[PDB]
């Protein structure tokens, strides 16, 4: 194998890392040779999971980590539901204290760089952006950031944690150079 990879599967638990094979090799992808993208779709996938975990117990609809189809019929479900209109790309979740798709990212470089990026791509209006950074960093929508600032410190910590892990490794600066 490779040392990212067995640094990933040591990393993060068994049900995240077999979510990021499945989601990988559904778009053509092996985290066998990608490892610095099998190492972001795992702290992609943690990272929403950790932020469903915040609110509560019924608050979040999770959009990640389901198969591409499944994860359309859901936000088909949503949309005729509540009425709020289909957004061109899947969002991460939706919120139904706010009522609104929520996209999370998760970036390397600064928060205002990767929310131009996502805002613009997007390009919905309707679904909230969260961003998160490996350095504290966060940035949100209309400065409504969702969940209260215990969750969100528990997050960033994280993602500061496999940042050090990496780097003990020697695999933060290829990984931080991959995006
Ligand atoms: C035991 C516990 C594990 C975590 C797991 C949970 C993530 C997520 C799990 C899967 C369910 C699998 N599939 C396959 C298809 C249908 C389907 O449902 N997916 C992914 C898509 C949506 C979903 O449901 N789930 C399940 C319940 C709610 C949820 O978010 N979460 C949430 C916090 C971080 C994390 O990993 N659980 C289980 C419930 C409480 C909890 O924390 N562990 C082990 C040690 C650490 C830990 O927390
Ligand atoms: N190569 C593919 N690996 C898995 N899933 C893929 C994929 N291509 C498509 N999807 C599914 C639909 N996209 C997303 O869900 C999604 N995309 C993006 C960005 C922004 C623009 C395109 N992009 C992208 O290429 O993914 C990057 C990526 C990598 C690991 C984990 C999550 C995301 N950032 C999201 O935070 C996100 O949730
Ligand atoms: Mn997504
Ligand atoms: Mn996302």
Not at 34 to 61: P, Q
Not at 70 to 77: G, I
Request: proline share 2%.
């Amino acid at each position: 194998g490779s040392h990212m990879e067995d640094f990933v599967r040591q990393c993060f638990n068994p049900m995240i890392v077999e979510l990021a094979e499945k989601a990988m090799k559904e778009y053509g992808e092996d985290p066998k040779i990608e490892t610095n993208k099998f190492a972001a779709t795992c702290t992609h996938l943690e990272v929403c999971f950790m932020y469903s975990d915040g609110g509560s117990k019924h608050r979040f609809e999770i959009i990640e980590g389901r198969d591409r189809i499944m994860a359309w019929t859901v936000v088909n479900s949503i949309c005729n539901t509540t009425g709020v209109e289909k957004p061109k790309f899947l969002p991460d979740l939706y919120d139904y204290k706010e009522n609104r798709f929520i996209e999370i990212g998760v970036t390397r470089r600064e928060v205002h760089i990767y929310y131009l990026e996502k805002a613009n791509k997007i390009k919905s209006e309707k679904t909230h952006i969260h961003i998160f950074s490996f350095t504290g960093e966060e940035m949100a929508t209309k400065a409504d950031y969702t969940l209260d600032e215990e969750s969100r410190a528990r997050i960033k910590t994280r993602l500061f944690t496999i940042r050090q892990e990496m780097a003990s490794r020697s695999l933060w600066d290829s990984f931080r150079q991959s995006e």
